[PDB]
Design a protein around this ligand. Structure first.
Ligand code: NA
Ligand code: NA
Lengths: 478, 474
């Protein structure tokens, strides 16, 4: 409780965070990762909790250690996930949130943030194209899609809330083959079962095929299942595709189906007049999942769920059966909207950055990410040994690195099997060297290829010249 | 510009220290700065615009957001089950937000992939298990939804693929003092609220094993298949603790999943004195435990522990070679249904390292002690009436105003008293001297929570003296 000791502690800890985590964490001169084999890091960390406390110095050193051996996700050469970058205003928002440590649950304990969330959700709905609606923030995009499924099930068969799924006919939902696994996880968690997820084929560019969607819908109807929801993707996690929302909307409307748009990754594109055409027709959706923590670098878990409904379907669905004595408009309380009880404050980090950058500052960051995606594509097409998997529609640049030993050997019967062995070796070498982290995955018959993500707001051409030169160095003997 | 970033955050942290941490823990300051919703909207000027704002305007927005927010760490904040500001946990939280990674793979979160297991390993130890599984979740409501789902999958693994229509009607059982997340989770998981069979609670708010087993037998007679029993070791209102060793016996006789919702009261396991309240918890299949509530770790410290050592957690929430260059068993992505997951272990681990097991024991024991002092002063003071003897740190009590003292036999005494707490709540919130919760159950009564680590007897003398002041004309 001693205030002077507390301030001195937090100020000392903040100095280590600033120097070692923020400044040194975003410097290209430092490493992205200080690799240690698990057991060696176990010993280095000395994690075992004990009965006796430790001195101030031993804790501050545990901070320096935790920072040092952690990956620097805000590094200009961190391309391993869909998120990248460390916005200082967002960080300022994050710190204020953790210090106030409240629950986004009632106006009584979170008055500022209960209103802030309403405004932010109102702006997001505007960028979607709605002048009215409902919505909530959720802990991750996976939960935003489970809400959408559940809301569709309840909107069509409200008895499900009480009698359960055994009182309903078999239900069928539809999503692209390029979806995030959160649809199949949510379907089983919601009791529908993985079989209830009918996969729709994607075209050459990774976009759902509206002709096959209805073909699936009609077949599902013929098997006894009842179509109720369609999930399009506006920014797949691998290729960065954008499903045709206006063509899928037509299909949903022709069958009176819930139209949900998983825009967790690509929904942030709606802030740029230049590239927002990629989500044309999204205003015809019933629900939209949108994670500004990915592209705008707001920090996890910035995950929103927007709804076009204006009848409190959200409260009637996730509400309970239990005030009439409180001294304020209880419409501000959002407890009946979610199935959670306590909920973090996830709007401040986004709102504060948005206040500092302005709508313009965030547009340029999106435009600046698309611009650098062109530069990366330029260098891949100009450089030998780098082969683009496909033309990128987003900031996801998928590409192989063909080492010298395989260039020209495409007609070899085992060309695929050996080329698939290249990225795993290049990934291991870059992590242990600590120079960069790039993701890679197989995609069906396609061999292990990289997946760059041009999203870090401090990225520069020099970083793309390095990672491309770095791969050439690390794969010269392959 | 590195210097601009450093100078920006350093200036922002100065505002956080003064207004949020120091002034937030000062008893001379207010707990809440009440503003009518419409006024606060205009005051805050939340509307987002095309043009950004200057550094000066941002720093001013920080102080304003802090000023009008509630001070959950104030010595006179008793509105929720959480209260207090552990500085070590706060340090961990800031380190967490700055490194901004996902508790998903050892590749991107090597330090925390190990840290979390050790913490979860210590929690399983305090439960009484030398082995098991577990993960952190975003709130205890999700910890109970996972537990429900794990039981459904463990008994009927075909459910994951074929759904609930491929299964017989399922029935779960819980006390009338359960968290409402049970009825929500049951509906969210597709079982339906009717699948939740309510069991009667005794005079102390505790589940009655005689009624539990009676319901189970009725469920079997109606065609349903009992599969799970959800006990509570620290209800949200009264602070009850179900008899875990008696319910375990019933679960044992019917081969049912025994889950213990210890989100609130699980922290008692750190005190040798008071851990007898959870005897039999080592006989559970699963246990939900939130260190953010009592220990002041900060939301969302909510764990889900398992006695299972057969990777039931991955087989249930997983997704269905890759060639990665390290033991992929370290990755915990298949354990949860989320994809990216926050790091919630550092704040607890750092505090536990600084306080030691003894320092955290000291806090729990001192919370029970201060809870007794509150009960002492309530029984000695006129106008304060205890609802029932508290077994935890939840002290439920009425305040009978002077106009109702001695009039207990009036036919409308109860109705008149139920109108007292709502007015005392409004007057304390608009005055800003303290925030105490109250709930309906006979008549609206208060629910103190002796959890703030910096609480003192002077604070208990104030809230009792303050209530008398706010209700002298009622
Ligand atoms: Na090329
Ligand atoms: Na009394």
């Amino acid at each position: 409780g001693d205030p002077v000791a507390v301030e001195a502690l937090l100020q000392d800890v903040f100095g280590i965070v600033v120097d070692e985590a923020i400044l040194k964490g975003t410097s290209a001169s430092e490493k992205v990762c200080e690799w240690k084999e698990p057991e060696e890091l176990k010993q280095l960390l000395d994690l075992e909790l004990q009965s006796q406390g430790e001195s101030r110095e031993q804790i501050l050193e545990r901070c320096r250690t935790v920072i040092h051996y952690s990956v620097k996700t805000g590094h200009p050469r961190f391309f391993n996930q869909l998120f990248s970058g460390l916005d200082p205003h967002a960080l300022a928002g994050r710190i204020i949130t953790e210090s106030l440590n409240t629950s986004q649950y009632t106006y009584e304990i979170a008055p500022v943030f209960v209103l802030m969330e309403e405004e932010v959700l109102k702006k997001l709905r505007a960028l979607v194209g709605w002048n009215s609606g409902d919505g909530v923030f959720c802990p991750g995009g996976s939960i935003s899609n489970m809400y959408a499924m559940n809301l569709a099930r309840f909107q069509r068969y409200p008895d499900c809330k009480q009698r359960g799924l055994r009182a309903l006919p078999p239900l069928a939902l539809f999503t692209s083959k390029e979806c995030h696994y959160s649809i199949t996880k949510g379907a089983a968690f919601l009791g529908l079962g993985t079989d209830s997820v009918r996969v729709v084929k994607a075209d050459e560019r990774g976009r759902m095929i509206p002709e096959d969607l209805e073909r699936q819908i009609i077949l599902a109807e013929a098997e006894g299942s009842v179509p109720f929801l369609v999930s399009a993707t506006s920014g797949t996690t691998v290729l960065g595709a954008f499903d045709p929302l206006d063509a899928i909307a037509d299909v949903c409307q022709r069958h009176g189906l819930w139209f949900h748009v998983d825009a967790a990754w690509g929904g942030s594109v709606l802030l740029s007049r230049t590239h927002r055409h990629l989500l044309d027709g999204i205003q015809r959706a019933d629900s939209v999942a949108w994670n500004p923590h990915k592209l705008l670098a707001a920090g996890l878990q910035c995950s929103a769920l927007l709804l076009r409904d204006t009848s409190n379907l959200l409260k009637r669905c996730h509400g309970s059966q239990a005030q009439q004595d409180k001294f304020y408009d209880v419409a501000l309380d959002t407890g009946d909207k979610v199935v959670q009880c306590g909920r973090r404050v996830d709007c401040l980090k986004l709102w504060l950055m948005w206040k500092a950058q302005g709508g313009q500052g965030l547009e340029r960051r999106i435009d600046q990410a698309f611009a650098l995606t062109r530069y990366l594509v330029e260098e891949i097409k100009k450089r030998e040994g780098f082969e683009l998997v496909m033309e990128p529609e987003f900031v996801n640049v998928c590409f192989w690195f063909v080492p010298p030993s395989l260039r020209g050997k495409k007609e070899s019967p085992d060309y695929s099997q050996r080329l698939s062995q290249v990225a795993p070796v290049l990934k291991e070498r870059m992590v242990k060297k600590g120079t960069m982290m790039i993701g890679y995955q197989p995609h069906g018959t396609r061999a292990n290829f990289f997946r760059m993500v041009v999203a870090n707001p401090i990225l520069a051409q020099a970083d793309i010249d390095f990672l491309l030169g770095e791969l050439e160095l690390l794969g010269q003997d392959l």
